[PDB]
Amino acid sequence: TWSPLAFKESRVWDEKEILYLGRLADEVQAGVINEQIAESLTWLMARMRNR
C-alpha cells in the first residue's frame, strides 16, 4: 500500500503596511506592496520545490 503526505502554508499582510510603505530613496504614492507580494508569491513556489 501507498498513501501520500500533505503540506501547505500561508502568509497575510495587515492594514498598516499596505498603504504606509514606499521606497527608501524617493517619495512614492504607495505601490511597493504590489512589488513585494509578487516576490513573496514567487517565493512560496520555491518553498514547494525545496520541499
Partner: protein, 51 residues
C-alpha cells in the same frame, strides 16, 4: 481653504532660502593719471529647513 489629494501618507516641506549679496559698494574716487584699487569681498549664504 479648498481641498487637495496626494496619494501619500506623509507630506514633508523643504524650504531652500538664499540670502544673496547686496549690490552695495558705490565706486572709488579716482584721478585720471593713476592706477585703480581693488574691490572689497562680499558675502552670500544659503540655508534650508524642514517641516
Amino acid at each position: 481653504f479648498p481641498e487637495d489629494s496626494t496619494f501619500a501618507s506623509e507630506l514633508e516641506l523643504y524650504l531652500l532660502r538664499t540670502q544673496d549679496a547686496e549690490q552695495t559698494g558705490m565706486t572709488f574716487v579716482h584721478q585720471v593719471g593713476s592706477t585703480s584699487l581693488p574691490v572689497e569681498a562680499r558675502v552670500a549664504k544659503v540655508d534650508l529647513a524642514k517641516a
